[PDB]
């Protein structure tokens, strides 16, 4: 038995798979989602936690397993969301700052003047935008009330939503974070395997409240035998994204996925050595074992399934699933492109003045229309990516495999497929996330080794491209047209 | 009893006026509007006869009024829109093409290219663009059978629609109309008021097929008794908006007018001689009083209503009236723009080439925000053609003449008033384009002279500016920058 915890944007996660891969029971809980003002997010570190544990009691129930039975656990949170919290307590100091917060921006932009965005993006292999926890954090630590001084001495610990697991789960015990977790961290080299103390002063937040760096498979403690019913051993932290990597089994260099949540976010497998792209792609780890690390080049997309959300929150569709019946009653769009960038624009573009832009709108636009348009924006989206990734160094995608929300969607993915000219597999484990977490569980608990997950991944499916090469690049030149007017729209 | 026909875009209204312009009786009835292709509009020349038949009708039983009863008849048209009809069977031989159709801009830009927009320009007062009917004869005259040499013959008749009113109305007999429908067809000369061979010989158009050109006060015949029980002397003959523009009293120079309706025309009083505008305005007839011709210069804006009646088909809202408590439940729009212009853009830009564009979305932009935008929408679009009459070849506009469908939502006035910073109007008669044509009429009947009109104008309210210069000009910039973003994305 496999347990995983995945701590999602917008809801708490938990799946018991078995030790081959296979899932046994699941249970899901959203939480609030807290909006201070607009492009701000923030999330209740207490609503979290208590769906986490929620979850994790209501897969075993609803399997009927006893928790002597676990073997290990695993950890899959969102990736950037920071909180900051006090050691003795155990309480949370502030709400917490998502991923997709909209704040930070200004300093990313002093920094930036500072000379110092260089410095970073060959080190931490990301950028300066509010997207990464680094500003994050030091906002925080510099606007609650008096907050700055107190973190000068260690009486607060700080925590991606996956330290703020191990500790609720260890309740004060350990303190930690793995790489990936953390490279996804202004601060984290990702040369030297360990933060940089430059990075640390070059934004004055102190080395007094980071975790610290055990990797994926490693030792993270025992939980607390009272919140789910005995001592389980956790060998398996990751970020959620870098997990469902894992999980779609996509250990050859060269081997890529998209994950469709909230946002979307592609990675590809670039073995060894890391990727500094410099046309707009992230280089980051995708997991360490016991030690050494994967790299793989990435690409963001704050928004994707908000995209369809928002259609929602305004009434162009009742509930959330007549999104492909429309969508599905037009053959096109009749010239219209929607640029879904509510929060700015992730990659690999990464401008943040950029917002939700529709265009080519006549008397006749639909609903049908506007459905379908939503749909093909998440997928000129990652065509960007795919196009970026395809020359920052390589060699062209023959394969892009897809998990997520998203995904349940087959229009939607028969879109991407016409959209990028190239083949989409889905696998026969939806819950990718989970299953990339529990599997580098048992990985590093001896019991199953990367090559036991190779060979135990299967394909469910495969959408094929239909669409002739003519159509696809025509849509593709009126989609870039669109970005270009996207762009920039927020006075600056 | 003064009997105006209004025969609009959408539906042919009647009402029946007492000699002092005051309503008595309203009939309304609707026509199919035919959209062949995209961007094409057409209306049934015999739905839109019968129609106006059918209202004329009405009215007088409703008011319990006889023909004879009836001193004089004035019509008044949408004012674009071409029929072409057999002259021996008064049959229509093809659909009449709306002012708002555009297939004619391939010919605009090919008839631009031989250089012979500036001709037209001083001669008519307009521009090349698929709105005046003129590319519109050509059309059917390349795109048709043997219609070219079916013209030549003279057994073929031309004319807009009250042209076709006005041949029905008499059985034939009179083939007419006035100076200022007929200078919206780019075939006429609005400073010797007449027909210019010269632009016909450049468009290739036959003559044998023009209707004669008489006053606005002139004798347009008499009814069949048939018809409406007994003859009725028709001596008012208006474009539409150069009927709001009388109804609404603006006899002097320098007063102007915007009726809202499918979309919305401003209008303003140049007096005694035409003010050739290059900087994106029109010269058009106010009206032509046995000769005398007054002149004023117009602004086109294409999508007025229909901004609301496309977000009523999407289902943005629910009725063109639910717009009003749903956009004042908001302050702003949230920074979010909506240029709608579905079919490019009129005045003071004439870009075929813009679309419908949404510019500003972020996560949390509600209904009521994108209801707002659509209202601002509007009264930006008023502002850009007020900024272009004014800060030119005049002086300043005191205040804004309102009436049309619009204009009976006092949010969008209040909006529209406080962006444009001057004061806003609405009549006590909201049927202004109809009791112009009435009231025209009267003056062809001798029962009144110019002079009464202005003395009986009776005013019901007038909306203040409410807004800071500051804020003003701040949202202005963003408009601007919003257009800017919808220009051009069809391609050329």
């Given at each position: 038995f496999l347990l995983a915890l995945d701590q999602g944007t917008t809801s708490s996660r938990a799946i018991l798979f078995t030790l081959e891969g296979r899932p046994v029971a699941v249970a899901k809980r959203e939480f609030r989602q807290l909006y201070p003002k607009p492009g701000w997010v923030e999330h209740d570190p207490l609503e979290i936690w208590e769906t986490t544990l929620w979850a994790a009691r209501e897969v075993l129930r609803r399997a009927g397993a006893?928790?002597?039975?676990?073997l290990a656990l695993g950890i899959t949170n969102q990736r950037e969301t920071t909180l900051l919290w006090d050691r003795k307590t155990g309480k949370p100091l502030h709400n917490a700052i998502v991923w997709?917060?909209?704040?930070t921006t200004p300093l990313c932009e002093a920094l930036r003047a500072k000379g110092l965005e260089p410095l970073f993006r060959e080190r931490t292999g990301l950028l300066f935008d509010?997207?990464?926890s680094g500003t994050k954090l030091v906002w925080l630590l510099e606007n609650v009330p008096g907050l700055k001084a107190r973190a000068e001495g260690g009486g607060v610990a700080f925590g991606t939503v996956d330290t703020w697991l191990i500790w609720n789960l260890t309740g004060g015990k350990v303190h930690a974070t793995d790489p990936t977790n953390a490279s996804?961290?202004?601060?984290?080299?990702?040369?030297?395997?360990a933060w940089d103390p430059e990075l640390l002063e070059a934004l004055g937040?102190?080395?007094?409240?980071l975790p610290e760096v055990r990797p994926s498979d490693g030792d993270f403690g025992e939980t607390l035998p009272e919140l789910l019913g005995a001592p389980v051993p956790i060998r398996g932290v990751l970020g959620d994204q870098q997990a469902a990597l894992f999980g779609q089994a996509a250990?050859?260099?060269?081997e890529g996925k998209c994950t469709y949540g909230t946002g979307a976010f592609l990675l590809l497998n670039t073995g060894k050595?890391?990727?500094?792209?410099?046309?707009?792609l992230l280089a980051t780890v995708a997991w360490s074992l016991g030690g050494r690390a994967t790299y793989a080049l990435e690409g963001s997309l704050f928004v994707a399934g908000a995209a369809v959300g928002w259609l929602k929150e305004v009434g162009?569709?009742?509930?959330?699933?007549e999104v492909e019946a429309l969508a599905a009653?037009?053959?096109?769009?009749?010239?219209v492109y929607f640029?879904?960038?509510?929060t700015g624009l992730g990659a690999?573009?990464?401008?943040?003045?950029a917002r939700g832009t529709l265009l080519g709108?006549?008397?006749?636009?639909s609903r049908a229309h506007l459905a379908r348009a939503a749909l093909e924006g998440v997928a000129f989206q990652v065509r960007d990516v795919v196009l970026a990734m395809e020359e920052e160094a390589g060699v062209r995608l023959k394969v892009l495999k897809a998990d997520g929300?998203?995904?349940?969607n087959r229009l939607f993915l028969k879109i991407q497929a016409d959209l990028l000219g190239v083949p989409v597999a889905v696998p026969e484990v939806t819950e990718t996330t989970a299953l990339g977490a529990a599997l580098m569980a048992g990985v590093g608990a001896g019991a199953l080794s990367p090559e036991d997950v190779a060979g135990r991944f299967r394909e469910a499916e495969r959408f094929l491209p239909t669409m002739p090469e003519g159509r696809r690049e025509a849509l593709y030149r009126r989609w870039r047209e669109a970005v270009e007017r996207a762009k920039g729209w927020a006075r600056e």
């Open positions: 006893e928790a002597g039975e676990v997709q917060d909209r704040r509010p997207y990464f996804r961290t202004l601060l984290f080299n990702l040369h030297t395997l937040i102190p080395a007094a409240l250990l050859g260099g060269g050595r890391p990727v500094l792209s410099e046309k707009g162009l569709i009742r509930e959330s699933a009653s037009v053959e096109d769009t009749g010239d640029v879904p960038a509510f690999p573009y990464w401008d943040p003045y709108l006549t008397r006749g636009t929300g998203m995904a349940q």
